[PDB]
Design a binder for this molecule. Structure first.
Ligand SMILES: CC(C)(COP(=O)(O)OP(=O)(O)OC[C@H]1O[C@@H](n2cnc3c(N)ncnc32)[C@H](O)[C@@H]1OP(=O)(O)O)[C@@H](O)C(=O)NCCC(=O)NCCS
Lengths: 366, 38, 316
């Protein structure tokens, strides 16, 4: 029965075998949010590889909050060791940043949502541009469409969801559509489909997952009763029918959009609520989860149901690829680097940001 | 234990390892799945 | 002479498992540790004998615990209560043998598995016919039977656990003597979603599955007569015919199952002409090997072992 610190020390001892690279950083305030920018890899003088990261603060009202942009300068071998990290921009922010997302079609633009449910648009080059006020309470749901420039979804503890269009010209500060009828409790997450520009999914503390169409008067095309509430969902980047959702019961569930009546499968491993989910953009079938058990887990859907030896089965279900046990408190957020396959940034409750990449010796990276 | 019919405990844990071959490639895989914290 | 050591017994010896048909056939369990603890020892009973008996057809269970003497004590295990907790509630007859016989006589009058369940195949063996049936575990009749035979998984398969009978992905195969209706053995099997990549998944609406053999049991009186092979072949053949099944898998097989599986798979390969295919110099394009394994529905590791074996065997 190892304490958190004894388990960390054990993890630390195994890092050179399990990882190509791990960087650990203590932030002065926690970040509730993490996202890699799509800045192309570029080698700098000294042989470091530049990437960029968006984080925030949560000062609990003690100091000014900030949206921050970090330059992560990685060792060159990360592409096949230590990094320099540099905060290159800080912009004042009203209350804590619960989510910050760049606009795919113009990553100079970053949307944030805060502890009062106010949405903001920031420009990297010019700072705060717009304040988008609809929600009246803390919001954790925020997602930009990869398919329609400036199409933005937000959702709130006040049970409401808004659609914004901020990419066109004109005034973007008023929502183009709002819903008071989707859920009867906290909106935990909302996400755009990766192929149908009009489809989005929402999950709520009311134990529903809904698949929605922005054009339809009635909105909802499918309603799923969740075993316990889901905190998060994610859509495949390869299949137009596949998604994942996960939450309180600790299992990561897979669904087929063509038949939402029952889950395809659920994957076990987490020992507490799952809070975040992402599909890999690089490998069809790879899913990553994080949770309140302080773990991140990487999954291969193509190994669901695979035959194992008894010793192998003792370490978990076959779809489990790897567990990141570097964090010592619940994971606030994580992001898969879109330019560098298997590079992850994850932040935990107690002020730690880790940048890491699993061993290239793992069969899944090939 | 989704679909498990042999997920119970064995009578005894074994004392001799057929995997003294650690720090190898499949050893990495097991380590990764154990999260390096077994 | 005083032999207080005789108040401690092997659980594997004390437990007499009987299948009663025309005669009572008695045999020992291989494991008792999930019932009576890891040392598989029972303390506090002198000359302890634990009868666990089943009608050869209905598997209506009977329990009788006997001893010459016992330590009156609270630290002392209630051997009977322990065993009953692994058996169906209020479906076991205790001590009263005559009452037990009266019970399954009446049951034998009622319907067989073969009246309710779906028929899979037939085979002849030793100059006798046998039938394989399959069913779900949601069926009340199938549940009643599976609760009766379940304990055999614990007593004969190391690390077995009782399965979740509420889980509809469980399918059970039942092996019966066709004329006498006696239950020869059973197999619990499961289906897992098989993701074949976005292209395949997006193209067919029909869900695909890896089928898995979990608990595979021929009752001890009937072993070493070919039943294991015939039953395995019957199940695999029905899975080869099932469009939803992509691969045949097995949960943590032991050495004995390893050999059965390998012997049957090889024989199937030769029958299909794969001796001529798997030669050192045959055209073996990557997509043909892929196509071959999928046609065969063989698990990837098993498939490779088999090909390697055939290369070595017909050479050499
Ligand atoms: C296996 C079982 C089903 C008996 O059925 P079976 O078909 O008669 O199998 P057999 O033991 O007779 O084996 C077939 C025989 O063919 C013969 N044979 C022919 N060619 C052979 C070859 N190339 N290799 C080895 N055996 C060969 C052998 O006599 C062989 O017996 P052996 O391999 O045990 O020495 C039974 O043991 C059982 O259910 N046991 C407990 C449950 C269990 O452990 N299940 C696995 C875990 S789920």
């Amino acid at each position: 029965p190892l304490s958190v610190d004894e388990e960390y020390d054990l993890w630390k001892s195994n890092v050179p075998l399990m990882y190509d690279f791990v960087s650990e950083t203590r932030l002065t305030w926690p970040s509730l949010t993490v996202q890699w920018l799509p800045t192309p890899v570029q080698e700098l003088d000294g042989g470091f590889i530049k990437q960029e990261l968006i984080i925030g603060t949560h000062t609990s009202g003690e100091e000014e909050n900030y949206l921050k942009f970090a330059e992560i300068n990685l060792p060159k071998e990360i592409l096949s060791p230590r990094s320099n990290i540099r905060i290159t921009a800080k912009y004042e922010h009203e209350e804590e940043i619960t989510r910050a997302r760049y606009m795919p079609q113009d990553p100079n633009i970053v949307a944030t949502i805060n502890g009062q449910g106010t949405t903001f648009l920031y420009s990297r080059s010019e700072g705060l541009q717009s304040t988008l006020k609809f929600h009246k309470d803390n919001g954790y749901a925020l997602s930009f469409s990869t398919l329609v420039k400036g199409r933005l979804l937000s959702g709130s503890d006040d049970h409401t969801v808004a659609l914004w269009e901020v990419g066109s010209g004109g005034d973007p500060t008023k929502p183009v559509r709002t819903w008071n009828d989707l859920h009867s409790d906290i909106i935990n997450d909302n996400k755009w489909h990766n192929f149908n520009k009009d489809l989005f999914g929402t999950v709520s503390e009311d134990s529903l997952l809904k698949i929605n169409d922005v054009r339809a008067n009635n909105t909802t095309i499918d309603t799923v009763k969740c075993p316990q509430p889901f905190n998060t969902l994610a859509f495949s980047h390869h299949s137009s029918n596949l998604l994942a959702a996960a939450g309180m019961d600790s299992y990561v569930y897979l669904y087929d959009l063509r038949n939402m009546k029952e889950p395809l499968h659920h994957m076990s491993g987490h020992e507490d609520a799952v809070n975040n989910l992402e599909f890999s953009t690089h490998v069809d079938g790879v899913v990553v989860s994080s949770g309140s058990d302080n773990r991140l887990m990487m999954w291969d859907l193509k190994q669901i149901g695979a035959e194992q030896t008894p010793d192998d089965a003792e370490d978990g279900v076959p779809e489990l690829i790897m567990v990141h046990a570097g964090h010592r408190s619940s994971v606030n957020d994580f992001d898969l680097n879109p330019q560098i396959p298997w590079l992850v940034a994850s932040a935990e409750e107690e002020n730690i940001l880790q940048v890491w990449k699993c061993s290239h010796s793992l069969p899944i990276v090939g | 234990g989704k679909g498990l019919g042999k997920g119970g405990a064995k009578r005894h844990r074994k004392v001799l390892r057929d995997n003294i071959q650690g720090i190898t490639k499949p050893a990495i895989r097991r380590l990764a799945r154990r999260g390096g914290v077994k | 002479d005083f032999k207080p050591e005789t108040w401690t017994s092997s659980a594997n010896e004390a437990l007499r498992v009987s299948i009663v048909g025309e005669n009572a056939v008695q045999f020992s369990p291989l494991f008792t540790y999930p019932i009576y603890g890891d040392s598989e020892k029972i303390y506090g009973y002198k000359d302890l004998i634990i009868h666990l008996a089943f009608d050869s057809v209905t598997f209506k269970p009977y329990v009788n615990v006997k001893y010459s003497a016992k330590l009156g004590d609270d630290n002392i295990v209630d051997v009977e209560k322990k065993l009953l907790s692994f058996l169906p509630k209020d479906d076991v007859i205790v001590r009263d043998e005559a009452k037990w016989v009266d019970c399954f006589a009446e049951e034998r009058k009622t319907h067989n598995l073969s009246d309710v369940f779906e028929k899979v195949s037939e085979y002849s063996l030793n100059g006798e016919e046998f039938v394989v049936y399959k069913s779900s575990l949601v069926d009340d009749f199938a549940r009643r039977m599976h609760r009766r035979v379940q304990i055999f998984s614990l007593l004969f398969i190391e690390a077995a656990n009782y399965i979740d009978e509420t889980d509809p992905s469980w399918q059970i195969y039942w092996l019966l003597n066709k004329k006498t209706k006696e239950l020869i053995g059973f197999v619990t099997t499961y289906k897992y979603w098989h993701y074949l990549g976005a292209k395949s998944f997006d193209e067919d609406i029909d869900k695909k599955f890896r089928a898995k053999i979990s608990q595979f049991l021929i009752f001890p009186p009937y072993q070493n007569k070919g039943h294991g092979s015939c039953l395995y072949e019957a199940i695999i053949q029905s899975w080869l015919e099932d469009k939803s099944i992509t691969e045949i898998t097995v949960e943590d097989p032991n050495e004995a199952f390893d050999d059965l599986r390998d012997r049957n798979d090889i024989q199937r390969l030769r029958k299909l002409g794969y001796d001529a295919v798997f030669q050192k110099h045959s055209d073996l394009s990557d997509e043909f090997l892929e196509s071959s394994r999928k046609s065969l529905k063989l698990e990837e590791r098993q498939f490779n072992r088999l090909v390697e074996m055939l290369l070595l065997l017909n050479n050499s």
